[PDB]
Amino acid sequence: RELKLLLLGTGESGKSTFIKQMRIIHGSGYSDEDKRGFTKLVYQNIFTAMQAMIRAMDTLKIPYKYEHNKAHAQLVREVDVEKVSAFENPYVDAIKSLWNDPGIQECYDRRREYQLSDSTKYYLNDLDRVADPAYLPTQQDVLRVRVPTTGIIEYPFDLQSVIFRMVDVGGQRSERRKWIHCFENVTSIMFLVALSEYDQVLVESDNENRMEESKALFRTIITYPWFQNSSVILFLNKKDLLEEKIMYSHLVDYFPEYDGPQRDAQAAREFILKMFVDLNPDSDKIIYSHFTCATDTENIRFVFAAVKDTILQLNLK
Numbered sequence: 001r002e003l004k005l006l007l008l009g010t011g012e013s014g015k016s017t018f019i020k021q022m023r024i025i026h027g028s029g030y031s032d033e034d035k036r037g038f039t040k041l042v043y044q045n046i047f048t049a050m051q052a053m054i055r056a057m058d059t060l061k062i063p064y065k066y067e068h069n070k071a072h073a074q075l076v077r078e079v080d081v082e083k084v085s086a087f088e089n090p091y092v093d094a095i096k097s098l099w100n101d102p103g104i105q106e107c108y109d110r111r112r113e114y115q116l117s118d119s120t121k122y123y124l125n126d127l128d129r130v131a132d133p134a135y136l137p138t139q140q141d142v143l144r145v146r147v148p149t150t151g152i153i154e155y156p157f158d159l160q161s162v163i164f165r166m167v168d169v170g171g172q173r174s175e176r177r178k179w180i181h182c183f184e185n186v187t188s189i190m191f192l193v194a195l196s197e198y199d200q201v202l203v204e205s206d207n208e209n210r211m212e213e214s215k216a217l218f219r220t221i222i223t224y225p226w227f228q229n230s231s232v233i234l235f236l237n238k239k240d241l242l243e244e245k246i247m248y249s250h251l252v253d254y255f256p257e258y259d260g261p262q263r264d265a266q267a268a269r270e271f272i273l274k275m276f277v278d279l280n281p282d283s284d285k286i287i288y289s290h291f292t293c294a295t296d297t298e299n300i301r302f303v304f305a306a307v308k309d310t311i312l313q314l315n316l317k
């Protein structure tokens with residue numbers, strides 16, 4: 001009855017964000033209790049970002065500008081999110097002072113040297129409103145919250161006239177080996193790759209570029225013999241991150257083969273798309289690609305409007 005889909009990609013790529021977007025558009029919008037729960041999630045995300053960037057500053061031995069905030073920094077090291085609660089007054093001022101500190105700002109601008117959530121800037125801009133006790137996060141705040149998924153999570157859903165069940169899976173290397181069981185009757189595969197992953201290395205490995213791992217995984221998935229009868233769609237996510245990363249980072253250093261002009265977001269996107277589509281072994285196969293940004297509802301709407309039609313045309317029964 002209902003067709004089975006997979007959302008595949010390396011960790012942090014953005015699969016769960018697309019699941020949230022699909023639920024929001026063609027499902028049930030999140031309720032007040034949902035946002036109340038997500039407030040704590042946002043709180044621990046902010047705490048994790050603060051701790052990670054302080055640890056990065058320490059490892060990189062970058063001096064601080066504010067001596068007083070150093071005390072707060074120590075307090076930051078003492079905060080533990082296992083026995084977590086709502087944000088408290090003594091922490092909001094310290095976080096604001098740290099974020100306003102130019103030294104840690106430069107450290108974050110150098111974020112390529114360590115792992116960090118892409119939502120850090122958004123929450124930092126939010127500042128008091130998010131940290132305000134009267135926290136009423138909007139759909140954007142809920143979408144821009146990071147919660148590492150793990151294990152196979154089937155998400156039943158249906159279109160206006162057809163039923164298409166999705167499957168969200170983890171992207172961490174240790175977890176990918178659990179996918180064996182979700183390939184039983186795949187009707188079409190959606191693959192997510194972070195356009196901005198070209199600069200950051202994996203989390204599980206600090207020496208392998210994320211883009212190389214993503215390309216290897218895409219090749220491995222296409223090489224699967226039993227997917228020959230299933231369509232594949234390559235969602236190029238996080239274009240809004242890449243349009244700034246390229247402006248701030250040169251794609252030549254990551255992949256020198258991209259000899260195109262610098263600062264051209266469209267050129268870099270086209271180069272990445274060509275590089276990924278080249279990995280297919282046999283040209284008779286067709287690969288559909290769509291630039292997108294899971295954090296924007298309109299882009300997901302537009303992409304899905306055609307993805308559903310393509311899937312329906314692919315499977316006539």
Ligand SMILES: Nc1nc2c(ncn2[C@@H]2O[C@H](COP(=O)(O)OP(=O)(O)O)[C@@H](O)[C@H]2O)c(=O)[nH]1
Pocket residue numbers: 009010011012013014015016017118119143144145146147148149171237238239240241292293294295296
């Ligand atoms: N700015 C931006 N952030 C994104 C986009 N896609 C995903 N993210 C963020 O990336 C973080 C991690 O994505 P995640 O949901 O874990 O994807 P998953 O690893 O495949 O499950 C989330 O907190 C999202 O807010 C995007 O297109 N643009």
Ligand code: ALF
Pocket residue numbers: 010011012013016147148149150169170171172
């Ligand atoms: F990297 Al994930 F769920 F965020 F596998």
Ligand SMILES: [Mg+2]
Pocket residue numbers: 015016017147148149150168169170
């Ligand atoms: Mg996830």
